[PDB]
Amino acid sequence: MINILKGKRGLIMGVANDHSIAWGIAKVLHSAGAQLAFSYQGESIGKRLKPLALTVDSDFMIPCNVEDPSSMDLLFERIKERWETLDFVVHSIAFSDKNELRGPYYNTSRDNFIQTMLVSCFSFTEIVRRAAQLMPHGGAMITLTYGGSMRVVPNYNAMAPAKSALESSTKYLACDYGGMNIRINAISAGPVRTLAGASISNGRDIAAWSKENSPLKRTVSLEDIGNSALYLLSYLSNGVTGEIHYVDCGYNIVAMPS
Amino acid sequence: MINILKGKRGLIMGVANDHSIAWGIAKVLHSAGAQLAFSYQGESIGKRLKPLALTVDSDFMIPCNVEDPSSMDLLFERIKERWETLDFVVHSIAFSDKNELRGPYYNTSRDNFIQTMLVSCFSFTEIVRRAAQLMPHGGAMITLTYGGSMRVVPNYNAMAPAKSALESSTKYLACDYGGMNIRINAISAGPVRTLAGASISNGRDIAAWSKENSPLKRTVSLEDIGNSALYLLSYLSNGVTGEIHYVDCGYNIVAMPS
Ligand SMILES: NC(=O)c1ccc[n+]([C@@H]2O[C@H](COP(=O)([O-])OP(=O)(O)OC[C@H]3O[C@@H](n4cnc5c(N)ncnc54)[C@H](O)[C@@H]3O)[C@@H](O)[C@H]2O)c1
C-alpha cells in the first residue's frame, strides 16, 4: 500500500548477507517502488547478493572497494552506463578490526584507526560527492550510525570516533548540498539481534541489554530501519536534512534501568 | 594568590608563540605553582619557546612530531630522565591544510583528512596512553576543541569531523582511565586570535560574529582558557571527567541574534 518511490532509482551499499541492515533497507525501498543498484565488497558477498538482488527485481551489481577512490570512480562509471540520474543513496558501510573491538579503547592501533576512519567515515564523503553529480534535480542520501559515538559503549573502541566524525560530516555535507535540494541524513540504529553477535565480541550482551532496558522492550528490526530509511529518502521527510535520527526503540532516552 | 598547583608537574603540548592557547594555559598554570615541561614541533618554534619558557622558570623543552610514534616515545623518555612521575597533561595541538579550510566540505581531500585526523584527533590518544604510565596515583589531562565539531561552521571543513572524533575519544579515554583516578576532559573554546586560527578563511568574520552574538559580548581571553584549564586540572574538578566544557562566553547557547 506504498509506492512513494515509484519511478525513483537509487544505490545500495553495505549488503554482506541477508542479515545486513542495507538489505532490510533494500527490501523496504523496493516494495515502495524503487529500482535498486547494489555495490559489493567481495566475491562471497556477490554470490549471496545475486539471489537476494533478484527477489527485488535487480541484476545491477557492481563490485567496489570503499577504501580505493579509483574503485569508487569506477562504481559511478558503471552506474552511469545504465542511469544518467540517481534519486537516493544508502550508505551502510561499517568496518574495523574486530580483534581490536575488545578491551580498553587506548589499545586502538594507529593503522586500525586510520583504516576504520577511511572506511567507516570518509567513504560516505567520497560516495556522497560522487552521487550528488547524478542528482541534477535534487535527491536524498542516508548513512548509518550508532549511539556509541557520543556515549561510551564498551568494546566499541575505534568505531566510536569514526561514527562521531561520520555524524559530523553528515551535517557538513547537508550544508554543502542543501542549496542543490539534496538532503543528507543519518540513522542511528539500535543493536539488531543476531547481527550484533557477529559484529563484536559482546554484541549479544549489548543487544540483550538494549532489549531489557529500552522503553519498547524489543530490539529494532531490519524492517524498522527500512521504513525509517523510506521516510528519510522520500518526499515524506522533506523538512528534514542533517538529522541524526534515533531508531533504537528509544534506548537512548533511558538514563538507567528501572 | 593561588597555589593549588603547588608541587605539581605537567606537560604542555602545543605552544607556537605567545598567542597560542597552550601558552595562555601554561602561564596561568605556572602562576598557580606548577613546574612545566614543553613539547615543541619545529626549530623556529623552539627558538621562540626558549625565552617564553624561561619566564615561567622552565628550560624543560623537548621536540615532538605527533604524527611520528617514535618521536612521542622519545618525548616521554626525555620526560622520564627528569621526572619519574607527572601530574597533568595539556594537549593543545591542531593541524589542517590552510587551502582546504575554504569552500565546501566535500572538496576535502583524502590525504588532508587522514593527516588532520592523525594530528588533531588521534595524537591525543597517543599522548594519553604514554602519559598515563606516568600517573600511577592518578592525575588530569585536557585537550582543546571547538563547537564546529557538532554545529556547522563555514570553512572549518576537515577540522570538524576531526574535533568530533576528538570529543568522542576524550569520553572513551575517560572510561578507560577512571579506575586509575585519571580524569580526562576537554575545553571547547570560543575563537582566539592564534597562528593556527589564521589558517581558516574568514576567521576574522567568525570571531567578530561570535563576539557580537555572545551573551557576554566579549571574546574569550587566553587567561579565561588558562583559568578553566586550572580548574580542569586541579583538585577543584575532582567530580568532573569526560566533560566537553564550553568556555566561549556562552556563544553556543544562542539560537539566533537579537
Ligand atoms: N585558534 C582558535 O581560535 C581555537 C578555537 C578553539 C579550539 N582550538 C584549538 O586550540 C588548539 C590549537 O592551538 P592554537 O589555536 O592556540 O594555535 P597555535 O597555532 O598557536 O597552536 C597550535 C599548535 O599545534 C601544533 N602542532 C601542529 N602540528 C603538530 C605536530 N605534528 N606535532 C606537534 N605539534 C603540532 C603547533 O605546533 C602549534 O603549537 C587546537 O586544539 C585547536 O583546534 C583553537
Task: Give the domains, in start order, of chain B with CATH numbers.
Answer: 1-258 (3.40.50.720)
CA gap A246, A220 in Å, rounded: 11
Distance between CA atoms of residues B60 and B34, nearest Å: 13
- Comparing CA positions, the residue from A232, A255, A240, A245 lying closest to residue A4 is A232
Q: B248 — contact with chain A (CB < 8 Å)?
A: no
* Residue labelled with grid coordinates 545504465: A82
* Experimental resolution (Å): 2.7
d(CA B203, CA A127): 29
- What letter represents residue B11's amino acid? L
In whole angstroms, what is the distance from residue A49 CA to residue A7 CA?
23
Question: Catalytic one among B105, B106, B156, B251?
Answer: B156
Asked if B117's CB is within 8 angstroms of A114's CB, the reply is yes
For residue B164, give the nearest of A104, A167, A242 by CB distance.
A167
Query: By 3-state DSSP, what share of chain A in percent is helix, strand and coil, each rounded to 5?
Result: 50, 15, 40
The grid coordinates of residue A195 equal 547481527
Q: How many residues can be counted in chain B?
A: 258
- Which chain A positions have a beta carbon within 8 Å of B162's beta carbon? 165
What is the number of other CB atoms lying within 10 angstroms of the CB of residue B91? 27
For B75, residues 6+ apart whose C-beta sits below 8 A from its C-beta are B39, B62, B63, B64, B130
Nearest alpha carbon, ligand 1 atom 17: B196
According to DSSP, the residues that pair with B145 across neighbouring strands are B188
Q: The C-alpha cell of B184 is what?
A: 580526562
B226 in ligand 1 pocket by Cβ < 6 Å? no
CA distance A90 to chain B (A): 18
Q: How many CB atoms lie within 10 A of CB A80?
A: 14
Residue B14 in contact with ligand 1 by CB distance below 6 A:
yes
* For A68, nearest residue in chain B (alpha carbons): B110
Compute the nearest-CA separation of A232 from chain B (Å): 20
The residue with cell 576537515 is: B158
Closest by alpha carbon to A254, among A226, A214, A206, A194? A214
| Helices B69-80 + B123-132 axis angle, to 10 | 30
Cβ of A170 under 8 Å from any chain B Cβ?
no
Amino acid sitting at position B73? D
DSSP per residue, chain B: ---TTTT-EEEEE---STT-HHHHHHHHHHTTT-EEEEEESSHHHHHHHHHHHHHTT---EEE--TT-HHHHHHHHHHHHTT-S---EEEE------GGGSSS-GGG--HHHHHHHIIIIIIHHHHHHHHHHTT-BTBEEEEEEE-GGGTS--TT-TTHHHHHHHHHHHHHHHHHHHGGGTEEEEEEEEPP---TTGGGSTTHHHHHHHHHHTSTT-SPPPHHHHHHHHHHHHSGGGTT--S-EEEESTTGGG-SS--
* Sheet strand arrangement including B244-247: B61-63, B35-40, B9-13, B88-91, B139-145, B182-189, B244-247
Search chain B and give the residue with CA nearest A151. B171
Measured between alpha carbons, how far is B97 from B201 in angstroms, rounded to an integer? 11
